[PDB]
């Protein structure tokens, strides 16, 4: 049960009639899944990485000058030239010179002087930029079977399984050890504005300093420095790192503007530090939606003798979880595999089993334990494990349970995004909207009930539909709409 | 040292130890007054060394020669701490929000808000219609 | 009676019913106090000082230049530098130099020259600004027992006591030698806009010239000269006292702008000369209001034999004081301690004691004197000192005194400022306003009377109230308000 | 007088008694031209003395040396009656009635024509007693300057 | 060099090559200290070279003579590249259709006031020609 | 016809009954005169110049300082003087010298120093200015008889004549070679605001750069530099180019502020480049309004037999002229002087002469040819020349012709300026306005016609006037005004 200690967990109870269910995975969240007669599961979204990102621009810095040449001619000799005004990877300037009688020239006018320099960047000083590719991102999803013999802490778990999803990927299946198979027909979407961001990397190869940043494409494309495409050898616009001095008679020094790494880092101060591992480049925003097939999966520990030895002690006390659930740690002393007889009671009544149960059929074997989880109804309640009994009180209201479940259903439907509507066929449009709405209403369809069984609910839906057709005042006509909604939901039957 | 090129032109190269010294070139003489010499490396700088007719004095040239033609001076700028530095300028780097914007406009325009609410409440007859008209009016108010 | 030599003496006769009384102390003023059976007392406000005013800015003049350095280089070598371009307390300038053939440069361009100078201020030429603080000012209150052995000059009194009042101060008691204890509760309000002014001091150490000035903070903050705050070491804006000559070949003379003490004195002429003594800084405006507790005093010499030997002569003639009283200095010949038998007569009437008496029970001792002071009613009056008698006449009219007392009372309530009113409780609201109003009317409540005595005065107030309840035209309904005011005044009983 | 520093830069110092004289540094010769000199003190000034080859003539410099290098001159500026004096201008401090208030009131009336006419016509229309109108208008005008 | 004027005062003139040299002026000796000299031309200058008794030290002067009287030094400021330059400030030099354009602009700009005036006159007056004449005048007078 | 390649030609057919006609000329325009029985002419206004303009302020640049002298004296000896302080052409300064013990002075106080410099402008660098004089301007008018032997190039025409006009001039006559006499009575008007413009000439003597500027008088007179009147020899305000440094003990350097031609051109970029030729000074806007006396002149070639040899071919094709006319160059083969037969046809109608003819009665002579021009009514038309004929379609509509001539008439009246109005007498006021109105309407008076001739036109105007006097609805009273307008036009007879 790894997700018991995150700050953003949510539940989905699926449906009794059919095992198929849908989920939304957001970075840092978790979606525990439950079934009427199948053991529970869990899901993750830990990393959104890309391997070998493509390269766009490669800015240089600390340009290295070499083999500078300057030449000039007297007035009326025609402008001078050097062979380097047309070679690849060079920078040149033209200006007049104040030649006179002291110089070898025969007149007293202004001549011409030209200078040229080759400009190749030093190695290990280039700031390369990379761009993601939505059609190649890799999404990571993890699932943890509810063995429950774990303290529920921060350390890793044994028996966990994983899978990877990419836009091209469509089908996948996992084994979950002896538990059984579960399928993930999934769909994925990129985080917002991929094209707006480019990753800048210095390649400095240093251990005690940051070696990557993430910034907007617009500012990056506008930086005033030398740049190149990959595979080229001549640097474009090198004239930004070279400043030429005033023109003397026959000399014009070409000053190197020096390294600028410090200025780039100061301007890049406060930008989020990028995350890089091996050839993987990570991201920190995303949406994944999958359909979980729970058809082939089966439960464990139903063939055990179910000992009534009644020898148990509490490893920990009932502590209120951070998300409307009860955590309980128990240790046995029977020295044998066995089911844990558990009873929930309210109002001190002889009647039992008045609480919903996760970690279905908690048991013991030659080794392991129990991290049994309980979801008691609000108020005074009694937890029984074997011969031991403890008193615990749960805050909140049943109305609150329905309100929060509907609010999270609407919030999840909001998060599914623009993928929740298909206009190809009218039947598909209606079926998709109707299923999404029934996913939203699932929590409210099983709020408070008691009586004969499941079948009478359909009859009550028909009675509600007939009552809406009593030909009464319009202000109380909502019963017809409610009856129709309940009648479609009867095909699922999630409340009795 | 002095060298001859393939076009009949001479070239002179010197280290950081030839500041203000005379060097004999071919049939005449050359003088080096440059004050930024050093060892030889790829960061070399070179230029023509004009020659002045005997009976004159130099003007604006760090090297000059007498009784010679086509003299090129080339040397390197290494072995000493580095150069006109000037760093390149580079610049540094929903529903609830709309509702808040609406309320902010309402509080900054309290008189006009009083006018629109009183006129709609006074004119419209059905209560549900009064309320729906107010909701649409408020949503449209700040954005246009 | 030292306050007989000031132009603002004010009187306060207190109340017979309770001895608590209030005053207003304004610089140069006085408040002589009298009671029905307690020896008179006086009060001053001679000085308002603060000790060790805080320092705000330390203006320099006449900067001491030291260790000037200049260095320069030829064109095509890059601008030069000096180690003093980054230390604390140094001014520098940069310019180009017209290097040519005489200088060692081989190029006819423009070179670079920099000059740096250390700039710290000479001693004994720092103009410092100090600013007062309301929550620490000290107010001096002086009380002089009214013994009456004094010739009434320019000299200090022997037997006088003093005390100090600060915002924090609560109560004080002065013993007054043989007379008795007096309690002075007091309140303080600084002069208007203290924070508007800054005291400037030159530390010039001269005896015959001004050494302090008072000016606005707005003029001070804009004076163009070097400045620092205390706890600093590197002067700011030091370049305001150094002018750099034209960049010459490889030198830049750094001229010293010179002393500026003369410039500041001329621009600061006529400003009121602030007064300083030791570490104390005075002021020339402020309000002090004290409550005098006249509870514990006893009167002097009520047991002396009161010799009827009838032997005295005048030391000073009966003269018209500048404050509605007749001064009298007398010298005895009875050679023993003795009261001065004195009578006041008007219209040659056989009835006596028709004048109010200050210097209560004027007496003689082994050594001392009699400075008997009288407040005669206007008209024909004859003063008797033992057997001796002199003719005297008093100007003005009793009605004039009523007008004057009322005007001074309203002037005092105007002076108390915004602290004449209390808003915490309604009981306090009426107590404060009612007390202030009766302080104003007290002067008129004891103007002229004749008949039975005190008890009928309450009956007169009741009759006025009853007459004001005649249900006639509202224009003449003020008799009820006047009756109400008089009924409250009966609680004091200052005139029978 | 001469001195050698620890970084190879020889220094020459003179008092006000050496203008236009020859001084010996290392092997060669030095000439001092500066004529604003005096005795030594803290107000010391030091600068490079460019060295010039024989056959050259000084141009714009106040000292020079031949057949020597890295000679820095230094001297003081004390011992003479005193220097480009330019006193800093500073503003002189300023020394700091019913008719004046009446003047402020008439000025306010001349400038606030609209509001003044509005209040005057409104009180003229609403109040129907001449004595009450005159008294309230006098008080309103007396108070107008405070707002 | 040296010359004699007819008023009995001798004059000394020297090119840019006589800085810090001793020149024999009649009986005594004279020194030239200035270093911003140059060749001789019409752009000349001259001054009274003060004379100092031996034992005194020249102060704030760029010329001095010993055991001589009335010596004027003159020299020229030409032959070298040019000088306290301060360039003077001189400032930079700068029908029916125009009226139609002003009214077109006023109409397309103040649409509310033009509509109000047009509608007020249109509603108040009855004859079309009278309405048109009044509106034409009002639009023409729109610039205020 | 020189005006066949400009962009501003216009036609004025004058009057059949009377010979005098009026014209308006603007730089770059043209006007072609025509009559029923007289050959055509042309008119130009090609230059508006003045010769030898008056001079106003001869500004200077780059003052050439010469023979400076400086002198001074020790304190207590009386300020010194130089002879140059009283002569003309000298700038001098006076100040104090900080003399001391080193100098020959026996005190330690302040002395006096004076300096003077003879100031004159270097040659070939003065910026002079001139001011126009309206009474002296000369306006040139030319006329090109339409001989018709020209191919219409940019070259001068064989037979062109010229006349000069100035406000003083009254009458003139030209000979037109064998054609005859022409009278040009004329009045002139200067361009707007002459006194507001002054011309600036730099005397730089360069043929490939600007050498004359036209600028506002206020700016020119306010320019801060040296200036003088003509003939003087000592510059006023010469101190604006000389600056004096701080005085040493006995010397004061007198710096030359240097040349300022460069800043003047930079501050003057974006001002119109004046046009100058030799001793003349041109302008760029002006009118010339005249009366052309076309009475004594005669037509050429009325004696030739008009050869029916029928030997003609097209030297040039019928080209669409830029001003609503058809151009035509014909080549003859008759080998003798002869008339050119001309006809105009439309729709293949039997009738001819359906076109107006310019270059009246075109002929062939010993040398030349024919540049015959036509203006056909809009629509289908065929031009016939001897045996040959070509088809052509003319653009526009008859209503367009009328509106264009009326619009040009109104524009011409607008161009006549403020001189179209005469206040001498009421009869003259009315006559001038009425004739100006008929000058505007002459083009519309001959729009579309067919019938008998001239006399019935008067009968039509009479019938229209009679109809207008029916006392019918006042809104339709325009008939009387129309009849009067037509009847008044009958006096000119511009269309039968
Ligand atoms: C937190 O978990 C990691 C593995 O996920 C483990 O190495 C670490 O020891 C844990 N921290 C504590 C306090 O147990
Ligand atoms: C003030 O007091 C002193 C000391 O008692 C005395 O000498 C002097 O005469 C008095 N008067 C004046 C005007 O100083
Ligand atoms: C312009 O006129 C000249 C007159 O000599 C002539 O030579 C030239 O051919 C003309 N230009 C053109 C384009 O024909």
Numbering used by the authors:
A (entry chain C), C (entry chain A), F (entry chain B): 1 to 496
B (entry chain c): 1 to 82, 85 to 95, 112 to 162
D (entry chain a): 1 to 82, 85 to 98, 112 to 162
E (entry chain b): 1 to 82, 85 to 96, 112 to 161
The publication says:
The envelope of immature TBEV particle contains 180 copies of each M protein precursor (prM) and E forming heterodimers. The prM protein stabilizes E, preventing premature virus activation and its fusion at low pH with the membranes of the trans-Golgi network (TGN). Flavivirus maturation occurs at mildly acidic pH, when host protease furin cleaves the prM protein to a pr peptide that will later dissociate from the particle and the M protein that remains in the particle, resulting in infectious viruses. Our atomic models of the major viral components, the E and prM proteins, indicate that the pr domains of prM have a critical role in holding the heterohexameric prM3E3 spikes in a metastable conformation.
The E ectodomains extend outward from the particle surface joining at the top like a tripod, with the pr domains of prM positioned at the top. The negatively charged prM surfaces cover the positively charged E-DII tips, obscuring the fusion loops. The two opposing prME dimers interact via a symmetrical pr-pr interface with ~460 Å2 buried surface area, involving hydrophobic residues Ala19, Ala20, Val31, Leu33, Val59, Val61, and Phe64 of both prM proteins. The third prME dimer joins from a side via a ~160-Å2 interface between its E protein and E from another dimer and a ~320-Å2 interface between its pr and E of another dimer. The residues forming the furin cleavage site are held in place by a polar interaction between Arg88 of pr and Glu243 of E, and is zipped downstream by the hydrophobic residues Val90, Leu91, and Ile92 of prM fitted into a hydrophobic pocket on E.
